[PDB]
Every structure is written in C-alpha cells, then in structure tokens.
Amino acid sequence: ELQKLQWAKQTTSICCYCAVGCGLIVHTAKDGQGRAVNVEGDPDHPINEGSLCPKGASIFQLGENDQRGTQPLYRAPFSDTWKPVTWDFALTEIAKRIKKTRDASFTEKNAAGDLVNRTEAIASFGSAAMDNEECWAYGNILRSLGLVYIEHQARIXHSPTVPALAESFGRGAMTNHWNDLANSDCILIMGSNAAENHPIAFKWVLRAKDKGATLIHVDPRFTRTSARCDVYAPIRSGADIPFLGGLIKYILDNKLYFTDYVREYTNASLIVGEKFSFKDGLFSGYDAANKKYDKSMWAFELDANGVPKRDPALKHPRCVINLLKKHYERYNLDKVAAITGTSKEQLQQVYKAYAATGKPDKAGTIMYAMGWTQHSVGVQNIRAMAMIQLLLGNIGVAGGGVNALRGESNVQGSTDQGLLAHIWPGYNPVPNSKAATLELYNAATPQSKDPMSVNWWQNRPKYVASYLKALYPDEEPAAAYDYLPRIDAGRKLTDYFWLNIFEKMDKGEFKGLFAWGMNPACGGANANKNRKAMGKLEWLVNVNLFENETSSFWKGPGMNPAEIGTEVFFLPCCVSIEKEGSVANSGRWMQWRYRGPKPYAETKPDGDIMLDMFKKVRELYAKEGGAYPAPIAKLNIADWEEHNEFSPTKVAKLMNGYFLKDTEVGGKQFKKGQQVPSFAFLTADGSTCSGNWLHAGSFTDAGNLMARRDKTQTPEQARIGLFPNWSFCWPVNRRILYNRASVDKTGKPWNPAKAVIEWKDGKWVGDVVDGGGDPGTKHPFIMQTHGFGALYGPGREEGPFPEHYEPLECPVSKNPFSKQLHNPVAFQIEGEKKAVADPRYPFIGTTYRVTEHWQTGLMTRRCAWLVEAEPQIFCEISKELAKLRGIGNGDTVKVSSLRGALEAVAIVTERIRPFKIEGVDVHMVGLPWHYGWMVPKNGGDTANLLTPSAGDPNTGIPETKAFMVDVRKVWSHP
Amino acid sequence: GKMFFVDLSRCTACRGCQIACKQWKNLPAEETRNTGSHQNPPDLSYVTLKTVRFTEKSRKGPGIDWLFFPEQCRHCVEPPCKGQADVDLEGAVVKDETTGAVLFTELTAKVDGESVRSACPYDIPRIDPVTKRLSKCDMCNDRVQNGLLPACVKTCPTGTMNFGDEQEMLALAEKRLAEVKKTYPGAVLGDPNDVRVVYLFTRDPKDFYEHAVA
C-alpha cells in the first residue's frame, strides 16, 4: 500500500470553500491522534466523484499552515503590538466589555414609546464559513444579548435573490441542484463565472452539452467559462435588464411561451387594479420627497371574497400577461443593442436558442450569481430572468429552474439560521415595534380564501412557537416572545443593514463589533470608509484562522497605531477538517462532516468560543445584575453541550426539533422526547420545539439524515440524478422545488424522458412532491399567497416589473428607456458623490474572482501553491484602452475612483473589448478583490478601496459590479 | 502498461491538476510574479512537474481561442532521455515494465543533466542547480501500483484527464477525436503511437506550446 497514507486514519469531509459541496477524504496521522497528512477528493461523492478544483485540492496547505493563529492576542488601545493572552483572560474581558456596553445602550422603549428591548451600540458580522449548528447558536446568543445589527456575507452576496425568487416562486433558494444541470437542453450562464467560481459544476454543464445542450455565456469579459461555451456574447456591466427585457419581448411577440403552463401556473390571468400605471421611468405612487413607492397603487383587483380576479381567456386589458406585453414593447433589438454593446445578430442568436426551450419537453436553465446581484437593480435583474423561465415552462422541471449559485460552503445555511437583521431562523421576520404581541406578529402573515391555494406560510404560528420553545422551553411562546429584541416599524429595513452599520460606525454610534469569520476591512464596499470607521470602536472581537486586515486595521496603510483607541481581541478558530457539523450547499443539501485531526495549537471550534463567552456573560449578570437580564439568564444552552464541549449533534437534534409532551397532530400520535419527523407535525401551542422548521426532517428517529451516504435510486430518480438517499435537503428532501409545475392537471410529466414526479397508481413517484394533494387540485407554488408564478410582483421597492436604470456611477448622462437615469428609490448615503459621465473617471470599473483565490484571500493568500498561481493584484483592460493610455502588457497601473486608489499589474487582452454604447466606445477596467495589504509581500490591496457604499433599495447590497474609474500608467521603480 | 488521454476540448484551466500534483508530493512553491498573464509558474522547474500554459489566439467573430495546456512528461514508450542517460550511467532513468512510467532516480545527479533535457523532444526534464538531480512527472507511479488514479487525473473536474490501459485510452482518444472534430476541424492527437500521455488538441498543437509535439 502507499507509505504516505499507511498508518493514518481516513475520515470524510465537505470542502470549506464554495457551495458546490464537494466531498473530501482526510488522512490523519497515528489513527487520528496526529496532524493531517493528506486531503483529496471523495471518489464516492455523487457531486464531484473525487474531483477537486485547486482550492479544494489545497485544503491540506490551509489546515497544516504554520502562519495559523496559535492562541488569543490582545491589542491595547493606541498599542502597536499584539500581546499573547489566555482564553480565560480574553473571554472574561470580552464578557466585561459586552456587559458594560449592553447596560449603557439598552433601549427598553423607542422614541414613540413602543417596546423594543434591543442593544443599540453593538453589531456582529459573520459568518457563512461556520457549520449550521454554530450559526444557529451564534444568532440566538446575539439576539438574547438584544442585538438587532446582525449581518453576514449574505447581505453583500445573494440578499436580492431571496426577495426576487420569493416574489416570483415563494422561496429564495436555488430551485434545482448541481447534478440536475446535466438534464438541461440550454445552459445560459449570465452574471456568473461558473468554470472559475463553481468549477465542479462544469462537470455537469459539460455532461449537458454531451447529451445535446447548447452552452451560452454572456459576460463583459471572455473568461475560462467562455472558452468552453458554444456561444459567447459580451454585455456591458449594469445592462442586464435591457438584455432580458428584450428576451421577454422576443418571447411574447413570437408566441414562444408555453401557453398551458402560463395560463394555469403563472399569475398571467390575474387582473391588476386601475391604480397601477407606469410613465417615463416611474410606477404609480412615487413620493418624490421621501424616495418611496406607495405599493397599494399596485394591488390586484379583488373579487367579492378577497381573492384576485382571473380572466382565464387572457383578454382583459389589465390581465398581467397583457400589461407585461405592453411594459416590454420598448425593449426592441436596436435599443437593447445600443445600450448593452451587444450586436443585434448576437441578441437574435442567443434569444432564438434560449426561447426554444419554450416547448413543454425542453428545459433551459440560468446559472447566475454576483454579476446580477451586486447592483442597484439586483432584485429586478433576477425578477426579469424568473419571468422568462415561467413564460418558457422551465420552473419545476428537470434541467430548468433558476440556479442562483450560492457562494460560501454554508451561506445557504447561515441565512437559514437568520444571521441577517430582518430574519429569525427559518425566514420568519424579526418583529418590528407594531408587533407588541405574538398575535399581532402572527397576523402580519397574508391569508388566501382560494381553496386551490395552499398558502403554506399560514403555518408560521407553529414555527414561531416551536422556535421560542427551543430557546425558552420553561416559558409560554407568548411570554418568551418579549425576551427577543425588535426593530422600529417606521424605518426602511436598509437602516439595519451592512452599509448603514458602517455609516453609523463612522459617526461614533457603535462601541463594539464582532467580526466573526469575515474580513470587512477588505470585503465591504468603500474599504477606506470601513477602515477609518473601525477606528471609532471602543472594542472589536475578531474570530478567524489568521491575523488579517480586519484584526490589524490599526496598523494598515496610512494608519498610526498610536492615534487609534480600539481594543482588539483576536481569537483563533479551527479549520473545517478539525470539527464535526453540517454545511448546506447551493442545492440545500445539508451534509454532515467529521473531524480528522484535533484542533491545531490552542485554537477552538466557534461553537466552543461562543458558548464559553456567553456563559461568562450569564455569570456576570447572575453576579451583578444590569439591564433586562431575563433573556440571558433563561436561554436554554444546556441542550447545546456534552462532556464540557459544544455538541453539534445535540444542536442539530434541537434544530430538527422534538415533542416536549405526548401529542396528536395530522391525526397521528407521538411520544415525549421523540424527534419531529417533518415540519407538518409542528404545533403553535408549545407541544413542540424546533430551532429551525426547515430542519424538521433532517434528524428524525431514523437517525442523522444529513450523514446518509446512500447512492441508491429508483430508475426514474437515476434518470435525472436526485440521489434522494445522499444526505438531506430542505424542504423534506424536495430536491427540485415547484415540481408540481412539471406535470399537467392529470399528473403526467411535461417531459416524460426527464420526469421529476409522475402520478402512477395512487402515489407521486420520483422526487418528494412539492405540496400534498391529488393532481389538478392545488396551485403548484405552495409558498405563494395566491399559489401562482408571479410575472407581476408588487412587493418590490422599484415596482412589479423590471425596468432598466443605469448604475449610480455610469458612463451615460441619459437613459434611452426613460427620463429616470438611476433607480428612483436606490439606497445612497447623502453627501457621497457619484462619478456620472465624468471625464476624471471615464471607464466602467468592475470586480470579480479567479479560480485560484477565495474571497478577500485572507485564506488563500496564506497558501503558497495558490499565491504561486496568482501572486498579485492585476488589472484586465482591452488593447484599445491600453493604446489610449500608453499601457503595455505587464506595466504597473493606478486604478482610481472618487473613493480611493491602488496599483496593479496590467493584463492587456482581446478578452476585453470596448462597448459601443449609443455610438460611443466605452472602456472597462476589471479588478480581482482577493488582495490585501497584510500578505503576501507585493500582492497589492483590496479593489474595495474603489467601490461605492450605495446599492439595492430592497436589500442594501452594494454596487461592486458597476462603478466608474480612471486607469493611468505608473512610472516608478529600478 | 498505462496511458493518459488529455482532452483539451474540456479544460477550464482550473489548475486543480497543478495544485493536486504539489499536494500529493508535498512540493514547495516557486516565488512568482504577474508579468501580464494568469500563467504561473511560467515554466516547469525542479519543484514544478506540471504547469498550465495559457495562449490567446484569434477566432472569427466574438471571443478568442483560449488555449490551455497542462504540461507533463509524456512517458515515451521508447524514451530518448533514458538513451542519453544510459551513455553516462544505467539506473539513472528506468522503465516500469508493468505501468510504462519513465522514472528518474537519484543517479540522475551523475549524468549530464543538460544533455538529458536536450534529448527530450518535449523539453520536459528540469535540473536542481544545487544537487544536479533531475525531476519531472513520475506518473504518480506509486499510486498507480496500488490501484489509484494519478493525483492530477482524480482531481480533474471536466473529463479532461483520463487514465487506464493503453487499449481503452487509445479507443477513448479516437472516439473523442471524431466528436471534437465536428465542432473543431483542426483537432489532432499528439504523437499517439509514441507517448503514454496523448493530448487531444483543438487546433495546431504548436499554438498550445512550441514543444507540444515532437
């Protein structure tokens, strides 16, 4: 056998980088007692089959890295030095600062005198990089301390996708899964670099092509994805809506929609109120003064029973499908070409190819991510594509869907666990101030009187009650509800989000920050604002693998440590392979992973760090009292622990949930202490606890379903690779969502050759059906109020149809579609100037990734094989732009915006070409944002020195993908 | 013995293979810089046995022909490197009679390294200037002798890398050549009767690398 592996124990794990969720084999020396000796792919894993991209293939170099933190370090105010300290010192002092800050900043009641019970002066950032059990424990810890400013990666990543797809379909999640790409007949990759950023996905994309699919990449750059597609079309950054509205128009004009699917399954028939109009950029109900829409102007006309009226002939002028045809009739080839840079020929070619999946037995799929989300119009970009998919019958089918590609390993899961300011675990809203009782909270939920509309959210009362009974089990739901903090009902939700946290930090309003597995000194847009802002904190707790640009902002570029009063605690955490837990992939596959080696040096898993820190805070409250100590004293944390350690297994069981009492539910009978087998059998009365309802099914009486490694399939399941016995996906192992739309009212597949489910005997066969009920008896979209795929979606801040607006910094003074240049209700901070068609910043700036690095490169900048492949910040420009600026391939260049400047090596390439925008060449400058001042030497700093703190009014995601810059040659050096 | 079939019509230049090879052998990193290309390291060296070469060529209409070449020893059926090395000292270059692997030993430090390199039609061997030892791809021969795929083949996500018996891989190379030729009319197999690493190139192999073929 192999000398290297021989006397080493083998364990299975899941890649700690992207949301594909590839399987690892780990070898640990001396049957598990020594260090990792080897990490490589798990040949048995149904997603990667042993494959790893270079980030997965280098995990050994990350885990066995002698630059890793070894113990806590403390930076005294105005100090230029780290001091080594004990966990006992570090966690007692932090507990002290938490309490001191909580006591001095606690709001029992707001201005208006409503109850809110919230800590104003502490914020938390993180983290999508933690295991699902740690994320849920972490949120509950911070909420029990009264925090409302709780944010992570999701805010600045796929936040717009959740409302965009929820509005369209009922849920915000990726609709299909990685193995399902192979079933597609046309893969459109757009706002995505999937060969670089989801590399194992390309195994399945290429397998689609092997079985007859066309692969289309639409991107402002020619990339490693583009090299391997049949069709490449350029598009200018910030011009997706025109491209997609074009395609809506092309589909409607040429009768390429799936008629039966549109009539029965979309809100096509539903009649909108005479109140709805649209004129020269603005929907009806614009309040100019306050930058806000009166959404009530967009309501459907109700019948007599409070149900939206339907004309199933599609003749009424106020049918959605007729206002759709009217809204997108401006989006003609010549206007789209003129504003995208894309030629008429290329639109025609891509439109003809995609629109052809219209047929019932064809499936087209979109793979999108940050090229669409990181925009002032991000929600509307994703809405426009959701709409196209419904017109073409691609929602619910094998090889269809909206494949919103999630980023980090557990971003799907951290979001599920409510590490965002607007949501508790399971996407139940954070209460605002009007919701003074549980009844007033639960009564927010919209009702349907349509007997065919499941409107499944109506069960929210059960999930809220089970949630409070997981936290506070010796209490009534209604009494425990008062222990949890609330936001103000009069304030835009963007007030509670990433960009406004940093704006408030920059005015002195924050005393403490947890930077828990995030690097906002490099990851946050407008990095110079953030670096100065952190200097206004009294304390900062950085939990991470390595010293970094956040931990050490006080000794960054242009900083004098002696001027900066921030106390910093750096607490070193352990890598993925040194702990047990689950991570949820883009497909909602919740996968269990085991420990290989013991934690390195004095590093600790996050669960243990946060559990220790909370106990010391509870001890301080027991001993001295202070502000509202009840939430802190009463939080059930004894269910989180075993042999004096944090217990991921017992936290998973509690997130799945269990009966506190014997009970009868769904007319079925259950013992006390029994695991809730499904969210169906949860209750509003206190009979059941469940930390996260979406987890009810994950850990039943049959064992840990996330730990299943069973590739067994029926022949129908094998035809489209569901692998329903590999781990567990939410909800209740529904692998393809909205699968009711994949059949006719009989329950026969639209594509028998690629069937998701079929009515055969008296059973649904294939996937778990997405909603109970015989064929034809229910609307297929069970999380929607009205039960339909929304073509018209009136809950969105900018309006119920996508409309093109230029980025807040744009190369045009004038918008060809309307007199509204920018998004009329865009999130912006007064006094922050915007380079609009300014000669000083004449070029489009964009930021993106490479295959070989990860996020801010905090991790991969430490990994010598990945630095070897991509050693330093580069700048991609066309030959045309390089000629204009006298820039030679390999020259040093300085890229600048209103907000900052940095140097980079120029990559002059034909892979970037100028954009003919209204007859004028517009040049683009591309930067990767993986670089930072701390390491390596000569790597460069973060592209976020350039980016603006403005963005989407629905989610506050920054516009990191489209801004304005200059580039000049730099003449320095021997 | 064994053969690689390397279908460059599927390569995303992810560099999984480049990092997989260093992980399996725990090789060090070279000190690199960006000189206006993703390519790095720029060449094979004593400590880099595989690197992905990046060439930009033109095509009609939009985009470019982006040509990815993951370079490695071809494991010649009749290796000139061994012929050259046997002139100075037998045992410096040996052949696995079972796998076909061409293998460098420590006795390479006793032979004229620059003449071994110059005898290689693919310009593959690399010398350590300190010890005068030669290195290159060793076919992950120890993994192959124990029923495992080479590190770079197991890691590959796209079906670019393929390994197995010479009969199954030559039958694969021919099947795949005929499909790729439909969508790439200049596609050719690299010296397929002479090496155990058979590349399918989508156009003139010289566009991928000057030493792509003999």
Ligand SMILES: Nc1nc2c(c(=O)[nH]1)N[C@H]1C(S)=C(S)[C@@H](COP(=O)(O)OP(=O)(O)OC[C@H]3O[C@@H](n4cnc5c(=O)[nH]c(N)nc54)[C@H](O)[C@@H]3O)O[C@H]1N2
């Ligand atoms: N290798 C690697 N993989 C990663 C990551 C990483 O850091 N490195 N990070 C992970 C994370 S957290 C995330 S969220 C995902 C994101 O993955 P992607 O979204 O694929 O990442 P980006 O490369 O940032 O953006 C994709 C593409 O958007 C294009 N683009 C820029 N502006 C526009 C525009 O206005 N419109 C359109 N249509 N395209 C535009 C860029 O040219 C780029 O090719 O990747 C994940 N995977």
Ligand SMILES: Nc1nc2c(c(=O)[nH]1)N[C@H]1C(S)=C(S)[C@@H](COP(=O)(O)OP(=O)(O)OC[C@H]3O[C@@H](n4cnc5c(=O)[nH]c(N)nc54)[C@H](O)[C@@H]3O)O[C@H]1N2
């Ligand atoms: N200009 C620009 N800015 C961007 C983007 C862009 O495309 N362009 N992308 C945005 C997106 S999609 C995202 S997701 C954000 C990401 O921004 P950040 O999350 O701030 O990026 P990093 O901190 O590098 O990435 C994850 C961190 O998790 C840490 N980590 C790993 N394992 C563990 C663990 O077990 N515990 C803990 N506590 N930490 C761990 C890593 O060490 C690393 O520091 O950046 C955003 N910013």
Ligand code: SF4
């Ligand atoms: S980074 Fe993503 S694609 Fe690469 S090995 Fe990890 S999970 Fe797989």
Ligand code: SF4
């Ligand atoms: S041969 Fe395979 S692993 Fe290597 S760069 Fe190409 S696709 Fe990536």
Ligand code: SF4
């Ligand atoms: S490619 Fe060169 S180094 Fe490799 S076996 Fe052939 S002659 Fe020897």
Ligand code: SF4
């Ligand atoms: S066969 Fe082994 S030694 Fe040769 S390139 Fe691949 S991983 Fe490296």
Ligand SMILES: [S]
């Ligand atoms: S993410």
Ligand SMILES: [W+6]
């Ligand atoms: W992300």
